[PDB]
Amino acid sequence: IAQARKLVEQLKMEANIDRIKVSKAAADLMAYCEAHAKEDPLLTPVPASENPFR
């Protein structure tokens, strides 16, 4: 009963959340990826002089 009630309190709690459109989220993710692109040695092969595994 209460457990049944619980699934009601939890459902009410998560119901009222302010949400932004997915366009803003996609833009933020793309901006982050483009900003920190050059600092990814895995994506861009660095010279073997700085590679510690060569």
């Binding site: 049944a4 959340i17 459109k21 997915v22 996609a26 933020d28 993710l29 990826c33 895995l42 994506l43």
Partner: protein
């Protein structure tokens, strides 16, 4: 009558999420140039484990790592020189997870025996044994040098206290087994993926669930978390990996292929967040493009299934563990 009462709320949540769907992530990311082919060559190979490997966790300095096998042994390696440092026998030979503390002082492990044990590296003897779970442990991550969070098979996750040995907070709400978790960069929130095909977002300080995502169809075996702190990716048994979003509160992209019918056992991101690495049961790994959903390479060389995966803190190398009792370092 109460059970009936709840859905009106679920329908409202679904309607709100559908209203918030302004566009598609694929549509916005349409002019992005492809990353092209990505080739990785094995640089190091680590041997010494007598049986299959179920876990590993890169050190905080991106030099050392720990691994756990089913012969009941933890070995702390050294990636640069491929020579061991420690070998720790275990009381119980069934271990399913391991962790390595951010300060580099402690190492934890647990398994079918419902006990989480930590070890003191700078002294190798057992420091504290934590008990209270009624099922096997799936994962455990060092939140700090004094408190740790674990997820077990009794559909609960708990926050522990090393000095006292007693649970501080208990998280409840899942229906089936819990299989993985991941902590935010600031260690303020963490997510968990269960066997009822649902992922939940918790608050560590308070102890209440904030959101829930139920996009998958089968059990969830792995979960990672975006470097920015506003997204996370999951891997399930239905050969699909999805990318959710905390602010928008629904999924954005799905990664799948018609020629893949096996499962996923591990998921990890890269330093910049552009790539997504996932391990499969077809004895090989795959590399995905996060913003375009297209394969960009394959990592073959394992003779048995892959059960672990991790990327260094500085993003220089990726390590894979497999049931072939071998570890490899790619670059």
């Amino acid at each position: 009558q109460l059970r009936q009462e709840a859905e009106q709320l679920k329908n409202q949540i679904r309607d709100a999420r559908k209203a918030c769907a302004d566009a598609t992530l694929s549509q916005i990311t349409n002019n992005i140039d492809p990353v092209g082919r990505i080739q990785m060559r094995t640089r190091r190979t680590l041997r010494g484990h007598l049986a299959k490997i179920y876990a590993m966790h890169w050190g905080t300095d991106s030099r050392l790592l720990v691994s756990a096998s089913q012969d009941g042994k933890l070995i702390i390696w050294d990636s640069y020189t491929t020579n061991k440092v420690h070998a720790i026998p275990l009381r119980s030979s069934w271990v399913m997870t391991c962790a390595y503390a951010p300060s580099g002082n402690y190492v934890a492990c647990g398994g079918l025996d419902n006990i989480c044990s930590i070890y003191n590296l700078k002294t190798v003897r057992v420091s504290r044994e934590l008990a209270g779970h009624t099922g096997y442990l799936s994962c455990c991550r060092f939140l700090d040098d004094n408190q740790i969070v674990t997820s077990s098979g009794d559909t609960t996750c708990a926050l522990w206290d090393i000095e006292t040995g007693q649970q501080t907070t208990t998280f409840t709400g899942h229906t089936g087994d819990v299989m993985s978790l991941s902590l935010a960069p600031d260690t303020r929130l963490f997510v968990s993926g269960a066997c009822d095909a649902s992922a939940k977002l918790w608050d560590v300080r308070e102890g209440m669930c904030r959101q829930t995502f139920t996009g998958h169809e089968s059990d969830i075996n792995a979960i990672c978390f975006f470097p920015n702190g506003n997204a996370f990716a999951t891997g399930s048994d239905d050969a699909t990996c999805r990318l959710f979003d905390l602010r928008a509160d629904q999924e954005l992209m799905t990664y799948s292929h018609d020629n893949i019918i096996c499962g996923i056992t591990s998921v990890s991101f890269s330093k910049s967040g552009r790539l997504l690495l996932a391990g499969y049961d077809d004895f090989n790994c795959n590399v995905w493009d996060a913003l375009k959903a297209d394969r960009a390479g394959v990592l073959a060389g394992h003779d048995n299934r892959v059960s672990c995966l991790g990327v260094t803190d500085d993003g220089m190398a990726v390590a894979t563990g497999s049931w072939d009792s071998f570890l490899k370092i790619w670059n």
